[PDB]
Design a protein around this ligand. Structure first.
Ligand SMILES: Cc1cn([C@H]2C[C@H](O)[C@@H](COP(=O)(O)OP(=O)(O)O)O2)c(=O)[nH]c1=O
Ligand SMILES: Cc1cn([C@H]2C[C@H](O)[C@@H](COP(=O)(O)OP(=O)(O)O)O2)c(=O)[nH]c1=O
Ligand SMILES: Cc1cn([C@H]2C[C@H](O)[C@@H](COP(=O)(O)OP(=O)(O)O)O2)c(=O)[nH]c1=O
Lengths: 174, 174, 174
């Protein structure tokens, strides 16, 4: 059962859930905390590789994945990242997030950006008990026009669901 | 923890969750209420704009978004909407939905349409405590062939999860 | 509220949730059971049909869908299935899954494959109370390069949420 907004504020106070920087009350509502776009991106350069073998020898995998991914792109103040129709790109939330062993996060993108084509990371919704860090975001433009994305914009909504008990093998321990 | 079918029927009876028109027992099963496709659509006309700036000056934004979106398309009885491969379109559920401050909805599309390419709105699953209205749907054809969509068809499944208490800032109040 | 890893192990022991073959402790962590890719695939052959009418006369529907879908593709040991950019394909989990009437499953794909383009089945997350069987997976490559998928690879994560009571009309009974 999701935490309502005021229980989120509670868990943040007790020190049992951490979100950094801490979002003000404006950005905690209903059952979600709004999260923000960070300033570190990546694109793909397919030309160096014929395919990616997901389940294969971690040698060739490491090095193939090293070829295909752009170097980190960091945008100066007031600069957009243009995500063109049909492009997949990686970015990161502005906020860091630390979950205890008895809470799981679910990240949704914003419905109003998805109406213009933005699918964020959408084969995976789940932030694990124990997770501590930024969240890697995978964007895909499924609309006709390019979409300009600026660091600081609202990019998603985080909701939190207590588990039936504290996980034995959370992220930090395993 | 999701409401099972018979608790959904309960909450609808107590007057604590509203779905309009009210779906019969056929369309409430397991842990979901089947929802239906409405009769109001939109497509994109990119030609008037170079991009969309999501986080930018609400003036230019309003007017850019005014250009790019088709006018409302309403289908006469017995008429299909053809969603061609690679097209993003907006539609609406037939049913209206009103949630109390201590319940959150999650909308999934139907697995059997997704097997033919239909991604519905899938960067966002969440209907907020306090939401009252139709649900805007964003479709994308990810398959090879066009898909004919007729108002009244089953288009999704709504499930409901009580919150840990009533939200302080639900949709209606904020 | 999701089952943590050790409650999943409990429900599997009590005989109240079944996953076959049973995954070892390595593959149950936090709040999910890792699931594996099976060895039965399908692709599309659009050339025989102009469109698919989802909501139409189950005669023509059966036969149209019979045309468009490839025959079952079964991969010999050590063989990949190449899913090319922009292709939608169907596969199946290696594990079978049987849920009781008071538990609902949610399947997420893996975040690390989605970073390379793999959207799995993502308009639908939900395994119903009463479901018993393999899970049909719908893949879509949203990246630049083809992705090689081998039977046995990790393909997803299953999490489980008790309902507010046992469903009256679960999958097996309705
Ligand atoms: C997921 C979804 C939500 N909504 C509704 C439910 C939410 O309560 C509300 C807002 O969802 P939200 O994801 O917060 O998007 P936004 O950027 O508009 O705030 O809109 C839809 O109309 N359609 C959808 O497909
Ligand atoms: C989400 C998902 C569900 N299922 C199963 C689980 C559900 O219990 C069942 C039905 O899901 P549902 O979304 O109701 O699709 P449909 O139009 O076939 O009724 O199929 C899959 O086989 N694969 C999937 O990827
Ligand atoms: C869904 C999501 C998860 N994560 C985090 C949360 C999870 O705790 C963790 C692992 O998610 P998981 O789906 O298990 O992917 P993987 O193949 O890497 O194990 O990564 C992200 O960084 N970004 C995301 O978009």
């Amino acid at each position: 059962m999701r935490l309502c907004d005021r229980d989120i504020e509670a868990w943040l106070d007790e020190g049992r859930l951490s979100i950094n920087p801490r979002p003000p009350v404006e950005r905690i509502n209903g059952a979600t905390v709004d999260v923000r776009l960070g300033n570190k991106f990546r694109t793909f350069r397919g030309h160096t590789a014929a395919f990616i073998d997901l389940s294969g020898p971690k040698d060739e995998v490491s090095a193939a994945l090293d070829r295909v991914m752009s170097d980190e792109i960091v945008l100066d103040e007031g600069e957009a990242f243009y995500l063109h129709p049909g492009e997949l790109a990686l970015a990161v939330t502005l906020e860091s997030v630390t979950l205890p062993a008895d809470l799981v996060g679910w990240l949704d993108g914003r419905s109003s950006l998805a109406r213009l084509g933005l699918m964020v990371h959408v084969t995976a919704h789940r932030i694990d008990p124990g997770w501590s860090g930024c969240i890697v975001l995978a964007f895909y433009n499924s609309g006709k026009l390019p979409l300009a994305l600026r660091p600081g914009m609202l990019i998603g909504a985080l909701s939190f669901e207590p588990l039936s008990g504290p996980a034995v093998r959370p992220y930090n321990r395993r």
